[PDB]
Write a protein that binds this ligand. Structure first.
Ligand code: HEM
Ligand SMILES: C[C@]12CCC(=O)C=C1CC[C@@H]1[C@@H]2CC[C@]2(C)C(=O)CC[C@@H]12
Length: 452
């Protein structure tokens, strides 16, 4: 099988397609190109041939096998944000990625995942008592900012635990994400004309310098520390690995950065969307509340409770299916292969359009939000919200814990209303690297009225 997609008009196809990605945003471009051409098609980002693929089979092949455990993107852009051959998220050096990932994987499972269930709860509680910090005169809560701050507090107290300016760092993290998003697929040309990216360069510096402060203190505390065996955590594990000779200070520093931003970037937007679904789906809200009564009562949330919360689990999955935040995934082929029908050379970029795939394949009612879609056990090869295999989401397990943890603690205490008719469908979203609300609009606030 030869490959679908636009014509290579002797060097115009590549320029229009890259330009389309820049103009529309990565995610909407992927959808455009899938809807026009096949569910398996070719495009160019910069020069290199880049496949955009929504076919469940192809997705599964790619994530399963070890010769796709790379991503891609502008080397100059990645260098700019400090992700070029450094952390793990966009660390495309196979050997260096291989050696770094285990640190993340240890921290996001076993005992740390058990700790997380209560660290999440206490953080949100603590923030819901300080609801003045986020609420209007008119009673409107800035849910996004609330969520970001608890995601950051949570992440800190589990992986690092140094005191910090919660509010300031949340704003800096947003700046870093925006920068990352901007520069990820910008052509080299862009980086020559340098009053066009100095803007972003400063966002990165601001976050990177704020974290250098924290990791500096963390270093001091480790050197003085007496019973070092007792109080292990992600930051420490890394720092100790450097102190052997396994890791580089620069790399450590990026991994710490990357762990802190991860949840503020993604969890908060997912829970936001989930809250807007709860608002406009009262049928489901009851079921969830009934389940909480049955299972938890007015006891504190505990690790053993989370498996029992079957309805909420399905709610989360359906929210992530229907309204994804991470609707697409970037890989690269490290060896040649045949993939479904088509041949794929090494160095070929890949974009798995998992958000489109969740509407085209397995589910009874793909285009409407219903828990009937998760009434019958879903095979993991028809629904990958986190990905799987050697480079799947490192937080995939702990994330589900955290989402159940915060929804329970919030919905226990507050009914959630949404201003006007506003719903997830009527929210105006940007659809570039991730899929998230356009924050330059308004009517993104919510209202929290008590229970009992
Ligand atoms: C709703 C929540 C989340 C979703 C939907 C999500 C989804 C994803 C997806 C699709 C990937 C790409 C995996 C692949 O290429 O197959 C990914 C990567 C990643 N996620 Fe998440 N994620 C979430 C939360 C988190 C959290 C809370 C953390 C950390 C605390 C995290 C850390 C990562 C990391 C480190 C990677 C990169 C793995 C690598 O490239 O080696 N994620 N995530
Ligand atoms: C989940 C994630 C990591 C943690 C974080 O801080 C923010 C994001 C959002 C973008 C995700 C990324 C992981 C890698 C993804 C899936 C891609 O290959 C394209 C989009 C990108």
């Amino acid at each position: 099988s030869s490959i679908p997609g636009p014509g290579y008009c002797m060097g115009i196809g590549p320029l229009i397609s890259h330009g389309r990605f820049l103009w529309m945003g990565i995610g909407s471009a992927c959808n455009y190109y899938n809807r026009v051409y096949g569910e398996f098609m070719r495009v160019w980002i910069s020069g290199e041939e880049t496949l955009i693929i929504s076919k469940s089979s192809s997705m599964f092949h790619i994530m399963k096998h070890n010769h796709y455990s790379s991503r891609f993107g502008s080397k100059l852009g990645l260098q700019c944000i400090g992700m070029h051959e450094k952390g793990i998220i966009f660390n495309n050096n196979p050997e260096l990625w291989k050696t770094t990932r285990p640190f993340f994987m240890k921290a996001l499972s076993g005992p740390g995942l058990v700790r997380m269930v209560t660290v999440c709860a206490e953080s949100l509680k603590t923030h819901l008592d300080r609801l003045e910090e986020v609420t209007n005169e008119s009673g409107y809560v800035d849910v996004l900012t609330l969520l970001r701050r608890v995601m950051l507090d949570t992440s800190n107290t589990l992986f690092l635990r140094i005191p910090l300016d919660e509010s300031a760092i949340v704003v800096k993290i947003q700046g870093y994400f925006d920068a990352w998003q901007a520069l990820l697929i910008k052509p080299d040309i862009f980086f020559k004309i340098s009053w066009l990216y100095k803007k972003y360069e400063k966002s990165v510096k601001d976050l990177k310098d704020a974290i250098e402060v924290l990791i500096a203190e963390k270093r001091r505390r480790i050197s003085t520390e007496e019973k070092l065996e007792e109080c292990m955590d992600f930051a420490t594990e890394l720092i100790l690995a450097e102190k052997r000779g396994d890791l580089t200070r620069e790399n450590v520093n990026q991994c710490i950065l990357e762990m802190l931003i991860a949840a503020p970037d993604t969890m908060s937007v997912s829970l936001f969307f989930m809250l807007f679904l709860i608002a406009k789906h009262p049928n489901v809200e009851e079921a969830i509340i009934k389940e909480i009564q049955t299972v938890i009562g007015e006891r504190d949330i505990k690790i053993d409770d989370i498996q029992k919360l079957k309805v909420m689990e399905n709610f989360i999955y359906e929210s992530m299916r229907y309204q994804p935040v991470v609707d697409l995934v970037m890989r690269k082929a490290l060896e040649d292969d045949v993939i479904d029908g088509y041949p794929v050379k090494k160095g070929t970029n890949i974009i798995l359009n998992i958000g489109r795939m969740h509407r085209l394949e397995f589910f009874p009612k793909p285009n409407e939000f219903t828990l009937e879609n998760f009434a019958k056990n879903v095979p993991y090869r028809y629904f990958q919200p986190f990905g799987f295999g050697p480079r799947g989401c490192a937080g995939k397990y702990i994330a589900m814990v955290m989402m159940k943890a915060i929804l329970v603690t919030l919905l226990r205490r507050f009914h959630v209303k949404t201003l006007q008719g506003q719903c997830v469908e009527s929210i105006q979203k940007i659809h570039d690297l991730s899929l998230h609300p356009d924050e330059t609009k308004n009517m993104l606030e919510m209202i929290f009225t008590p229970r009992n």
